[PDB]
Design an enzyme around this catalytic site. Structure first.
Site, short mmCIF file in Angstrom:
data_model
loop_
_atom_site.label_atom_id
_atom_site.label_comp_id
_atom_site.label_asym_id
_atom_site.label_seq_id
_atom_site.Cartn_x
_atom_site.Cartn_y
_atom_site.Cartn_z
N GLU A 14 -25.71 63.29 5.48
CA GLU A 14 -24.47 62.69 5.99
C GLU A 14 -24.23 63.02 7.46
O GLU A 14 -23.09 63.12 7.90
CB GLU A 14 -23.27 63.12 5.14
CG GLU A 14 -23.46 62.92 3.65
CD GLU A 14 -22.15 62.96 2.89
OE1 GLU A 14 -21.34 62.03 3.05
OE2 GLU A 14 -21.93 63.93 2.13
N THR A 19 -25.82 55.38 10.20
CA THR A 19 -24.86 54.72 11.08
C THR A 19 -25.46 54.43 12.45
O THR A 19 -25.13 53.42 13.07
CB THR A 19 -23.59 55.56 11.20
OG1 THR A 19 -23.28 56.14 9.93
CG2 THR A 19 -22.43 54.69 11.64
N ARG A 145 -20.82 54.29 3.34
CA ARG A 145 -21.72 55.41 3.12
C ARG A 145 -22.64 55.10 1.95
O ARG A 145 -22.17 54.77 0.85
CB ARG A 145 -20.93 56.70 2.86
CG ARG A 145 -21.57 57.64 1.85
CD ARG A 145 -22.49 58.64 2.54
NE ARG A 145 -23.13 59.54 1.59
CZ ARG A 145 -24.32 60.08 1.77
NH1 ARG A 145 -25.05 59.83 2.85
NH2 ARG A 145 -24.81 60.90 0.84
N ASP A 167 -35.65 55.95 9.94
CA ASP A 167 -34.53 56.61 9.30
C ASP A 167 -35.00 57.25 8.00
O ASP A 167 -35.65 56.60 7.18
CB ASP A 167 -33.40 55.62 9.03
CG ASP A 167 -32.14 56.29 8.52
OD1 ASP A 167 -32.02 57.52 8.67
OD2 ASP A 167 -31.27 55.58 7.97
N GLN A 171 -30.99 65.10 2.91
CA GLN A 171 -30.94 66.12 1.88
C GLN A 171 -32.28 66.85 1.79
O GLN A 171 -33.32 66.35 2.22
CB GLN A 171 -30.59 65.49 0.53
CG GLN A 171 -29.54 64.40 0.62
CD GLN A 171 -28.23 64.79 -0.03
OE1 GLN A 171 -28.20 65.56 -0.98
NE2 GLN A 171 -27.13 64.26 0.50
N1 LIG Z 1 -15.65 58.99 11.97
C1 LIG Z 1 -16.98 58.99 12.03
N2 LIG Z 1 -17.72 58.80 10.88
C2 LIG Z 1 -19.07 58.81 10.93
C3 LIG Z 1 -19.73 59.00 12.13
N3 LIG Z 1 -21.06 58.96 11.89
C4 LIG Z 1 -21.26 58.74 10.57
N4 LIG Z 1 -20.03 58.65 9.97
C5 LIG Z 1 -19.79 58.41 8.54
O1 LIG Z 1 -20.32 59.47 7.76
C6 LIG Z 1 -20.92 58.98 6.58
C7 LIG Z 1 -22.31 59.59 6.41
O2 LIG Z 1 -23.17 59.11 7.42
P1 LIG Z 1 -24.65 58.62 7.06
O3 LIG Z 1 -25.04 57.51 7.96
O4 LIG Z 1 -24.75 58.21 5.64
O5 LIG Z 1 -25.56 59.91 7.35
P2 LIG Z 1 -27.08 60.02 6.82
O6 LIG Z 1 -27.75 61.17 7.47
O7 LIG Z 1 -27.82 58.77 7.07
O8 LIG Z 1 -26.91 60.28 5.24
P3 LIG Z 1 -28.17 60.64 4.31
O9 LIG Z 1 -28.51 59.41 3.45
O10 LIG Z 1 -29.39 60.97 5.19
S1 LIG Z 1 -27.80 61.93 3.28
C8 LIG Z 1 -20.96 57.47 6.68
O11 LIG Z 1 -20.01 56.91 5.80
C9 LIG Z 1 -20.52 57.16 8.09
O12 LIG Z 1 -19.63 56.07 8.10
C10 LIG Z 1 -18.99 59.20 13.29
O13 LIG Z 1 -19.57 59.37 14.37
N5 LIG Z 1 -17.62 59.19 13.24
MG LIG Z 2 -29.73 58.01 6.22
#
Ligand SMILES: Nc1nc2c(ncn2[C@@H]2O[C@H](COP(=O)(O)OP(=O)(O)OP(O)(O)=S)[C@@H](O)[C@H]2O)c(=O)[nH]1
Ligand SMILES: [Mg+2]
Lengths: 334, 494
Positions: A14, A19, A145, A167, A171
């Site tokens: 996360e 994103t 998400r 990407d 986890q």
């Molecule tokens: N407010 C805000 N929310 C964010 C920002 N970056 C990501 N998010 C939110 O946090 C959530 C998790 O981000 P995500 O893109 O799923 O991370 P990830 O590393 O790809 O998640 P994973 O599958 O590897 S576990 C998403 O719902 C996204 O909308 C940000 O810069 N500002």
């Molecule tokens: Mg991801």
């Protein structure tokens, strides 16, 4: 292949890598029903998580309105029901619960459990989302998400320069796949949820999210096959970091005691109108990874920190503009 | 002037030698092509039929025979098999113990690759019958064919050979294991490219072998059985480079003493009264391996880094008396005591066993160091150690191949497969020789070893925490391996 820049997005769960991929797709690049479905799933997950955590917190949080008590039970009743149809009754109950002050107070303590980042954004948009003709905006798609499992590739082009974004999942169980993208990688973009200093990871519910990111960045920086690969550090979630700093409920020093003695560096370049507290917190978080990078920075590779907000299209555009020349320079260095 | 002519003639000779050496470890196509992460040769090739074959009755055929006779019989049988591979448009990969495997449609695609594999297996059964007739033997072929995608290439730096790695290769090995002697055991996938030109019957795997530890009836996978239908200096530098390449490629196939013995005779065979064998398998590579991204090719690149690390251990002066025999999927095969042609003064008679044991320990250390560079995943190495008499031999005339045979190698593979991860399981006699040299072992218990019944096995790292109670593993049921490992050709059958 030689003229394309392979950018591997790394970081804990996360952090915001997906994103960043969405931002690249928005900028340089049937399904809508699926996107609406995951948006509604995020809504349901947020509301059920908050409702369940109401009684699980220490101390437990009681409902502001007792007449909404049954509205909790329904949310508890359909928590584990898959393929939910999302009836209007569910939307009404979720909106009524979110307007309740006890549920909001439980939400303010979301760092004591595992809650998705898009909770408030969709719980404030329930009315728009609940419509049968709901069209998800670009910000709605960015806020959605979805846990990423596996390796995904996105090819885009900026100023006739090709970029290949890898990407992966953040986890631990997914990190074993990361080495599959360590070969011939132009750059590593390490995304960090900077606002997650007060939260624990989902894997064990004990390790601090920022500490987990620091350990992961130490592993990546000191990797055998990434000795000459420069890591572009994306200090993400700057907006949520600003909200958490101005709120003052969860101090940074209460989880990282070295922050109390920390002082803002003189090379800081805060945005106009930025609070000094936010600047100090974000630069402390940046220096936490800068220490790791300089502990083994023998000149083979370099760390480029960027204060990014993934859900902000303009901020990500500016960050990628500032990173394009760095990326091509490291590709030349390869 | 005359020196230039002699250099040219000897350069032609050495070019031919280098070409022959390359051809013995690579297909003709890749051999012609030759003429952070380490260099990695691997490609994902689809629609490839993989065939494995085991000599049923090899243990009795090789009993009460000298090294020369056994190596000659094996050379005759494998020469018939190689002629068959040439005829059937198949590509032989390698031979391990009593096993012969090949691929059709790799690296050059073939529309009738399944037909090529089935024909080659049936011909192998026929040629084994002819071999029994001419050599007064009683042996058969257990052949198994499966068609799917393979990852073909080179793993490691020392003793590298062109091979095939995939879940489909493991499935073909499974087909061979579950097959019937004298029949070709084809998988459900292979039957999709086959018409009614063959006499085909139900595989009856559940009926024949009874229990299926692989899955519930091969996880719902059918199978079939087929029973049939200035100038001087420049020239000197060039010839020196060519000679270095030729001898380095010859070292890639056979040990140095074997190279000396092969300069006089076209065949090599030696009976070692005391030699040690270790099989070191990476148990959880299947956990790491995933075909979702690039067919798992990148995953095997990681494996290429681990095996190559083991290949850096052989370059150390301490492990100069240790010969790597082969790598089998995620399994590393090494031997010691073969190079000891002369009893050196002041050396312990069983010093080669100590050196091989230290090699296994250093492999454990190398695995730990490799895991230090992995992200929340640990590769587990499981080593089996045995020692005793064995027969070393070169298989083939044009395409050379070094190999070892005997109950020593079989028992070493048994300790590898029946051992525990992150520990070295040594045989009973291996314990008797190692513990006299200051090594401490935990008595794991007894393991069912063919020809010895319940034989005591000892795990090397004596766990100070807790105690290793006698397990007493008496499992004599068929050990069906769901992946390619060191048991290939080291588990004799009826
Ligand atoms: N407010 C805000 N929310 C964010 C920002 N970056 C990501 N998010 C939110 O946090 C959530 C998790 O981000 P995500 O893109 O799923 O991370 P990830 O590393 O790809 O998640 P994973 O599958 O590897 S576990 C998403 O719902 C996204 O909308 C940000 O810069 N500002
Ligand atoms: Mg991801």
């Amino acid at each position: 292949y030689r003229a394309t820049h392979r950018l591997l997005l790394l970081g804990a769960g996360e952090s915001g890598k997906s994103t960043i991929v969405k931002q690249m797709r928005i900028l340089h690049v049937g399904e809508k029903a699926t996107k609406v479905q995951d948006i509604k799933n995020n809504l349901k997950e947020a509301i059920e998580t908050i409702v369940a955590a109401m009684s699980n917190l220490v101390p437990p949080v009681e409902l502001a309105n007792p007449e909404n008590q049954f509205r909790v039970d329904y949310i508890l009743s359909v928590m584990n029901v898959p393929d939910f149809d999302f009836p209007p009754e569910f939307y009404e109950h979720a909106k009524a619960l979110w307007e309740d002050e006890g549920v909001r107070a439980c939400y303010e303590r979301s760092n004591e459990y595992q809650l998705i980042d898009c909770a408030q954004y969709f719980l404030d948009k329930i009315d728009v989302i609940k419509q049968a003709d709901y069209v998800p905006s670009d910000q709605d798609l960015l806020r959605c998400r979805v846990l990423t499992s596996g390796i995904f590739e996105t090819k885009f082009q900026v100023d006739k320069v090709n970029f290949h974004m890898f990407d992966v999942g953040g986890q631990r169980d997914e990190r074993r796949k990361w080495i599959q993208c360590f070969n011939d990688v132009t750059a590593i973009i390490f995304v960090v949820a900077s606002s997650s200093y007060n939260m624990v990871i989902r894997e064990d519910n004990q390790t601090n999210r920022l500490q987990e990111a620091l350990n992961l960045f130490k592993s990546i920086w000191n990797n055998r096959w990434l000795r000459t690969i420069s890591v572009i550090l994306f200090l993400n979630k700057q907006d949520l970091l600003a909200e958490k700093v101005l709120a003052g409920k969860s101090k940074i020093e209460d989880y990282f005691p070295e922050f109390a003695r920390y002082t803002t560096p003189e090379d800081a370049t805060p945005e106009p109108g930025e609070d000094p507290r936010v600047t100090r917190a974000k630069y402390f978080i940046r220096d936490e990874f800068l220490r790791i990078s300089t502990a083994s920075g023998d000149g083979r590779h370099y760390c480029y920190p960027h204060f990014t907000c993934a859900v902000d299209t303009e901020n990500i555009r500016r960050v990628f503009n500032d990173c394009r020349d760095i990326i091509q320079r490291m590709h030349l260095r390869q | 002037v005359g020196q230039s002519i002699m250099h040219g003639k000897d350069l032609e000779v050495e070019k031919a030698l280098k070409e022959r050496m390359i051809h013995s470890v690579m297909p003709r196509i890749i051999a012609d092509d030759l003429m952070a992460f380490r260099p990695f040769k691997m490609q994902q090739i689809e629609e490839v039929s993989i065939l494995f074959a085991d000599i049923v009755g090899f243990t009795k055929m090789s009993a009460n025979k000298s090294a020369h006779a056994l190596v000659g019989l094996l050379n005759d049988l494998f020469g018939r098999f190689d002629r068959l591979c040439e005829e059937t448009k198949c590509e032989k990969i390698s031979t391990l113990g009593d096993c012969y495997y090949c691929v059709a449609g790799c690296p050059e695609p073939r529309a009738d690759h399944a037909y090529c594999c089935i024909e080659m297996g049936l011909g192998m059964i026929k040629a084994i019958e002819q071999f029994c007739q001419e050599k007064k033997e009683m042996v058969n072929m257990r052949v198994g064919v499966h068609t799917g995608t393979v990852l073909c290439g080179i793993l490691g730096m020392r003793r590298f050979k062109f091979d095939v790695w995939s879940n489909d290769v493991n499935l073909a090995n499974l087909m061979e294991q579950l097959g019937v002697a004298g029949k070709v055991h084809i998988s459900e996938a292979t039957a999709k490219y086959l018409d009614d030109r063959y006499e085909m019957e139900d595989g009856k795997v559940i009926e024949r072998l009874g229990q299926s530890v692989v899955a519930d009836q091969l996880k719902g996978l059918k199978t079939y059985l087929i029973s049939g239908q200035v100038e001087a200096d420049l020239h000197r530098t060039k010839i020196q480079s060519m000679r270095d390449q030729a001898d380095w490629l010859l070292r890639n196939i056979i040990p140095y003493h074997v190279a000396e013995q092969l300069k006089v005779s076209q065949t090599y065979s030696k009976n070692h009264d005391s030699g040690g064998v270790i099989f070191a398998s990476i148990v959880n590579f299947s956990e790491f391996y995933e075909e979702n991204y690039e067919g798992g090719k990148e995953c095997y690149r990681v494996l290429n880094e681990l095996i190559g690390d083991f290949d850096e251990l052989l370059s150390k002066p301490d492990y100069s008396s240790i010969e790597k025999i082969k790598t089998i999927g995620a399994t590393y095969m090494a031997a010691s005591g073969l190079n000891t042609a002369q009893a050196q003064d002041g050396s312990h008679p069983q010093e080669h066993l100590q050196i091989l044991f230290e090699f296994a320990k250093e492999m454990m250390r190398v695995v730990d160091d490799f895991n230090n560079n992995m992200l929340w995943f640990n590769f587990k190495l499981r080593v089996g150690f045995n020692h005793g008499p064995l027969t070393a031999g070169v298989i083939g005339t044009t395409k050379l191949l070094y190999d070892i045979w005997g109950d020593t190698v079989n028992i070493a593979s048994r300790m590898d497969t029946t051992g525990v991860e992150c520990r070295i399981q040594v045989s009973e006699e291996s314990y008797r020789v190692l513990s006299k040299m200051g090594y401490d072992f935990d008595y794991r218990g007894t393991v069912n070893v063919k020809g010895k019944g319940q034989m005591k096995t000892y795990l090397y790292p004596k766990c100070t925490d807790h105690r290793v109670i006698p397990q007493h593993q008496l499992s004599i049921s068929p050990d069906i391996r769901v992946q390619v490992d060191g048991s290939i050709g080291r588990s004799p059958t009826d």
